Amino acid sequence: LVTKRDGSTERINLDKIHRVLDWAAEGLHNVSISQVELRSHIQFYDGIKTSDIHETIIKAAADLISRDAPDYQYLAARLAIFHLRKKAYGQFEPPALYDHVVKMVEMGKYDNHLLEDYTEEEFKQMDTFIDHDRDMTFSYAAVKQLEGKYLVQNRVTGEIYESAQFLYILVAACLFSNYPRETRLQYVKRFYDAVSTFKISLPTPIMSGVRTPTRQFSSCVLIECGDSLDSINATSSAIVKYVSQRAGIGINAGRIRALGSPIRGGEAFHTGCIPFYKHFQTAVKSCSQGGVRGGAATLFYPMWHLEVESLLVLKNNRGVEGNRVRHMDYGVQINKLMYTRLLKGEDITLFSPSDVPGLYDAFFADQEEFERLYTKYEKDDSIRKQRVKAVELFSLMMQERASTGRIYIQNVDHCNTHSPFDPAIAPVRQSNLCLEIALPTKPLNDVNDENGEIALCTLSAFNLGAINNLDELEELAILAVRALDALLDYQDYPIPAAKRGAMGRRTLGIGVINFAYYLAKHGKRYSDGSANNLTHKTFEAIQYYLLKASNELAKEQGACPWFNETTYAKGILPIDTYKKDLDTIANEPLHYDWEALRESIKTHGLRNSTLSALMPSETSSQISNATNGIEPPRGYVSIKASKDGILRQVVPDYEHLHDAYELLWEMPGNDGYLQLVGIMQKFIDQSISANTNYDPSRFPSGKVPMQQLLKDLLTAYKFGVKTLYYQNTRDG
Amino acid sequence: KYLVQNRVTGEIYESAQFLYILVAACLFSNYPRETRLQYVKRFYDAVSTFKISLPTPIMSGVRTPTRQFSSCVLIECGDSLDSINATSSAIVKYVSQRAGIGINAGRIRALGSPIRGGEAFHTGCIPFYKHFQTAVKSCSQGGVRGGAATLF
Ligand SMILES: Nc1ncnc2c1ncn2[C@H]1C[C@H](O)[C@@H](COP(=O)(O)OP(=O)(O)OP(=O)(O)O)O1
Ligand SMILES: Nc1ncnc2c1ncn2[C@H]1C[C@H](O)[C@@H](COP(=O)(O)OP(=O)(O)OP(=O)(O)O)O1
Ligand SMILES: Nc1ncnc2c1ncn2[C@H]1C[C@H](O)[C@@H](COP(=O)(O)OP(=O)(O)OP(=O)(O)O)O1
Numbered sequence: 001l002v003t004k005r006d007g008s009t010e011r012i013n014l015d016k017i018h019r020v021l022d023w024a025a026e027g028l029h030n031v032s033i034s035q036v037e038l039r040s041h042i043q044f045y046d047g048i049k050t051s052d053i054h055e056t057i058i059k060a061a062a063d064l065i066s067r068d069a070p071d072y073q074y075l076a077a078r079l080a081i082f083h084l085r086k087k088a089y090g091q092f093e094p095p096a097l098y099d100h101v102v103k104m105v106e107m108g109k110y111d112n113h114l115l116e117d118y119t120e121e122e123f124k125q126m127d128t129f130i131d132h133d134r135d136m137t138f139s140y141a142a143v144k145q146l147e148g149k150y151l152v153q154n155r156v157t158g159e160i161y162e163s164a165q166f167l168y169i170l171v172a173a174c175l176f177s178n179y180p181r182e183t184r185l186q187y188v189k190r191f192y193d194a195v196s197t198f199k200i201s202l203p204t205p206i207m208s209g210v211r212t213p214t215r216q217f218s219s220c221v222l223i224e225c226g227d228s229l230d231s232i233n234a235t236s237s238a239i240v241k242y243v244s245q246r247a248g249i250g251i252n253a254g255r256i257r258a259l260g261s262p263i264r265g266g267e268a269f270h271t272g273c274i275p276f277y278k279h280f281q282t283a284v285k286s287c288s289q290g291g292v293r294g295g296a297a298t299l300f301y302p303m304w305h306l307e308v309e310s311l312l313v314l315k316n317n318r319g320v321e322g323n324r325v326r327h328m329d330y331g332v333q334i335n336k337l338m339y340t341r342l343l344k345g346e347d348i349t350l351f352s353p354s355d356v357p358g359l360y361d362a363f364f365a366d367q368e369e370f371e372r373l374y375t376k377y378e379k380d381d382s383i384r385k386q387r388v389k390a391v392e393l394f395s396l397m398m399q400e401r402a403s404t405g406r407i408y409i410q411n412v413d414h415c416n417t418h419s420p421f422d423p424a425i426a427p428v429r430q431s432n433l434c435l436e437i438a439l440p441t442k443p444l445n446d447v448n449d450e451n452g453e454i455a456l457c458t459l460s461a462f463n464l465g466a467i468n469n470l471d472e473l474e475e476l477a478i479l480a481v482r483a484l485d486a487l488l489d490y491q492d493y494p495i496p497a498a499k500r501g502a503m504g505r506r507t508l509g510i511g512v513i514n515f516a517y518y519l520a521k522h523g524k525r526y527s528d529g530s531a532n533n534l535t536h537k538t539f540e541a542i543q544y545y546l547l548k549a550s551n552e553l554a555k556e557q558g559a560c561p562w563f564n565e566t567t568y569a570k571g572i573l574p575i576d577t578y579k580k581d582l583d584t585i586a587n588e589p590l591h592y593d594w595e596a597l598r599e600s601i602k603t604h605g606l607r608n609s610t611l612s613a614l615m616p617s618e619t620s621s622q623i624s625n626a627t628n629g630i631e632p633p634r635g636y637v638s639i640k641a642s643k644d645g646i647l648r649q650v651v652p653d654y655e656h657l658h659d660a661y662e663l664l665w666e667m668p669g670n671d672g673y674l675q676l677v678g679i680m681q682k683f684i685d686q687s688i689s690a691n692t693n694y695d696p697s698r699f700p701s702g703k704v705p706m707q708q709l710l711k712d713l714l715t716a717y718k719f720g721v722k723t724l725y726y727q728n729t730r731d732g
Numbered sequence: 733k734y735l736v737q738n739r740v741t742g743e744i745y746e747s748a749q750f751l752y753i754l755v756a757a758c759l760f761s762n763y764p765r766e767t768r769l770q771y772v773k774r775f776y777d778a779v780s781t782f783k784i785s786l787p788t789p790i791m792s793g794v795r796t797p798t799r800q801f802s803s804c805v806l807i808e809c810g811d812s813l814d815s816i817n818a819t820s821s822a823i824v825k826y827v828s829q830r831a832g833i834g835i836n837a838g839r840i841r842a843l844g845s846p847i848r849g850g851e852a853f854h855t856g857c858i859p860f861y862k863h864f865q866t867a868v869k870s871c872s873q874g875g876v877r878g879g880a881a882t883l884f
Contacts, residue, residue, distance in 0.1 A: 156850065214851060233824050237817030244813055266740060267798065271871045278875065279866035286863055287855040322874040447817065
């Protein structure tokens, strides 16, 4: 017996199954119909639902996804799309845009503002821009990512209500629904086509929200906690409210005084950081089943802090629960001085933030001033301190960083000397969960404190592999910077401090994807450093067009209220504060008129304080069958675990560039990678999420020497690198 | 504990009797002058001769700059993120004064409960409870000592 969608029973007509598969095979090479029809080991049994037939065939086709046969990527991707299209409308052919939006609003899935903002006529018109055939350009790995999260669906029953294309056009409509009716359509079609053809990438929260009653769209947050019972109580109640929205938290507690510090004079002594830190952890995991999953955050603190030794080991598996806060990630802030004490084989002094005045502030604002105060307090005997050999301390950090791989580094001096902000008015003293973002902050004395400031991320990324030449970045830069800045006025702000910053500086975090595929296409690699110049030219275009796009919006809608606090308003450009040592590895001259931009911005300002930051993109890149950000692919075919099964995705165009790519573990070292990352920092407003890779197989006795772990860390700083992400250690 | 002393050096500044009379003076310093001293002596003699007992926080506070005297607390948390955020920030402020906490979370919905209709499902009580624990132990060595509470 055969089960149909409507339930009407009927006999098995295998040819039907064959034809379906046949159709999806058209134009593909190295793909076998038999394999799937046998791989599936489909087990017929009297009365079987035809839908289970799809699940079975799709899965089978998936398991065949290999390097030797990459077309199984689209073959299966199309078989799925079919089931998805058929499981939502009752047939492949999608319903009219108008009818769709209508039916949805009735079910309370789409925001009713769509019917009010647009007319029936306009809808029918946008319906023409839609090209439902683009759903066949998706890779299997991308399809799965969409079906699980991207598409509007019933999490309980399992019903899916929309298709890929409808998602694109709608996200655009709501983002540009306020533009004048003169160009409102114009931007709608220009944006849709961009995202649908994978020219522009958007953050998961956006792709799965705009156009739905929901108003939570900010993936990550950066909170700064002061040295107060009140401050902490706030910083805690905050993370809670945010994590409930599944948004990552970057905590900065470095203000909290150290253990033993006198409280209220002499009526009590400080209890310690550990006690509070844990509280922050419970907050981050306040909304997870069993606390096991969800809730991710990275806490930061100075390297010269008094409790540095105790904080350095917090992520260690092996130790007393009383002195451990494993779940949270951390980021040790280091500066020029610390690195110098190591080279000269000298010691390091640990201080409590509340015992050395003007030390914290100078630590981010003025490196010189920091040195003055630092040295002074060292001789002061009355000041509580502790000496530690620079060689020992750093080793501890590198040790925990290796053991866990969640201990990140952040050079403060590089985040204030070569940044879009004025370290005196608004200095960067923290990062996000990604560790990519670099924005100023202000501690709150309460939840509704108006004078507080919270940094929020509204990211995006370009597809290096979707453009032909750098000039195509002009249009893209506009479609991106425009739609993004618009979201800032579309989403809500539960916390005042978060809103203040968003409206005050209107920052944006734009990155890139398919970078690996990019370098490969031009026949370049990471290690050798043959991509040094190309990288300089390519970014130089990505940043320029973005700075010219934000300036254009500033002339049409006014620059950000706090543009005055930015160095961009004082005539300072990224090409003026970049690490000087960067000229010893690149000679590629500027290809854009940065002088004509120095004026247009000097007179009309920028709608956004910061546009360009480099962040990791797992979900984004997948939907575009692209390579994660700038990071090189580990292997041709990557595997992951889903709720439906095993996922496989092959590097884009492996059929012609298999010998062009350079797998992660094919790299002799990290030299090249660092140089490229350093070159990027010269343009990126914010920071980059660079990982440190190591292969024990390339070391004597299979043990990574500490002489090499530091040797590389020093190189990173020497080239202006801002932050260091994960530290992968391959397992043969 | 009770006597005024220097916790650091170890110097003791007062004697038992002075503690008694002073605690009474500050407690009845607002009474009319005629009835003032009468109560001062009548209270002092009572406590000094062990006729009446007083809580530790009182015996070791009234008559000094400190103003924290409440030993124990009873907070009621509602079923919301806001409520919890408050109930947490509260226990913190109180435990810093070494005051015991009696929490009542029984309002917080149970695991699986639908949130915002169907846009999300409850995570559970355990996640929040722990948070309350970290709060209670927010001011303790290690986290082991101090900070006591009973949840209902
Ligand atoms: N009665 C059947 N005999 C043989 N194979 C069937 C039968 N019904 C379904 N299948 C198989 C063939 C396809 O692979 C898949 C069919 O699902 P699908 O074609 O999408 O919807 P459907 O079975 O209701 O008919 P339709 O082709 O009109 O959509 O399962
Ligand atoms: N009884 C306590 N036990 C342990 N830690 C405490 C205690 N009281 C306060 N703290 C911690 C929590 C915060 O980190 C910090 C409190 O700062 P804060 O509330 O501003 O103190 P304060 O109001 O008395 O003035 P000050 O900042 O000068 O000490 O010290
Ligand atoms: N994402 C979540 N996961 C698990 N529990 C949550 C989540 N979000 C909120 N909760 C819990 C904690 C709160 O006690 C409560 C909801 O708090 P709140 O923010 O006030 O929701 P709400 O008032 O908007 O809707 P509701 O009245 O249904 O709770 O449920």
